[PDB]
Symmetry: C3
Amino acid sequence: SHMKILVINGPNLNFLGIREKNIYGNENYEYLVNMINEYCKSKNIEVECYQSNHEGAIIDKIQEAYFNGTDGIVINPGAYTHYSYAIRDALASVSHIKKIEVHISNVNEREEFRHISVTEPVCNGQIVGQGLKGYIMAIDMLNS
Amino acid sequence: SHMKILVINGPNLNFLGIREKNIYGNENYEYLVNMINEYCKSKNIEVECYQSNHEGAIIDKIQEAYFNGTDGIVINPGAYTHYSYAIRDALASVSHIKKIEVHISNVNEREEFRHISVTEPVCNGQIVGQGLKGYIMAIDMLNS
Amino acid sequence: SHMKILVINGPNLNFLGIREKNIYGNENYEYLVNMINEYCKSKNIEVECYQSNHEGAIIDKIQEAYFNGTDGIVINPGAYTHYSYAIRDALASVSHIKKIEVHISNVNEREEFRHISVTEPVCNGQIVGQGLKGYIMAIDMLNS
């Protein structure tokens, strides 16, 4: 491992592929985790993929990254993107971990509330509406 | 059981009756659960009543309804009605489960923030300010 | 004990001192807990200091204060100050426990979202931008 990355997916993203196929595509959460894992293996990057529906469990996981040698975070906060100032403050508290925000869907084409990101101002980049390949694009930003 | 229903109550609604009697009435959470249970028994409806203060535990419970043959959901999200886009997205993710939103109090007579429901647009009906009998009215909408 | 107090700190405040030193100062969460503990001991006040990143765990802890003889609550909700109507409703549900809101930083000098407190209207006083000594000032309001 030249680099250690944590990928966080927020609430509901464990239901990728099996539900709302017209918004987030046909490929499921297991596909996404395995695609990430295999890409990172090919680049000699150590990766952990983590998902939770709990705001507090996401914060706890971000705090643990401060103590375990994490270099970078890829995060899709899901619906928490649009209101969780607590997750924003958790990201700000790990100022020397690089962070990339990812959204699968084109959020600017959906409900007005999805246009707001309270997390983006404390991150180091954002990828929107590129589908599951947005996670690979984020890893490459971290690895560059 | 011709039909299986899940009733979800959100944060603070376990303190019904013992607190804020002038807003939500004199009858407690135990009364509400037993009233639901007994009504459903009389109509040959299988019902589970669930309460949590945790946003993430409510989402987890909604996800479990996708796999256990639930037909309908009655939900009072409590204060999460006014801001939890994560609970809205959980309800949207179970598109073939019918959903009815319930509020005990007349929310339109209270603080301005209580006028907003982020969950109502993904439900199949809403009952407001009818007191505890609003839950029975919701079950009858599901059973019709 | 002439009086029993619960001090609640919300998300991220366990990272006091080690992170964001220019915003919240150089002294850490362990320092704050011990300073509180020792002050209360000197005044014959029984105190418990509690922290969690979980909104639902904070609500659960507030509910438990209704049954264990708590007289007063000092609360710094952290980022939840700016949006958690569920924590506001938990505080309102314990109407005979006195409550003081504390913020370490001068929130009126920071991002616009930090100017909003959804919890302050159901409390009995607020202390802003006095640093860690704001917690001692809150205990003295409760003890007066």
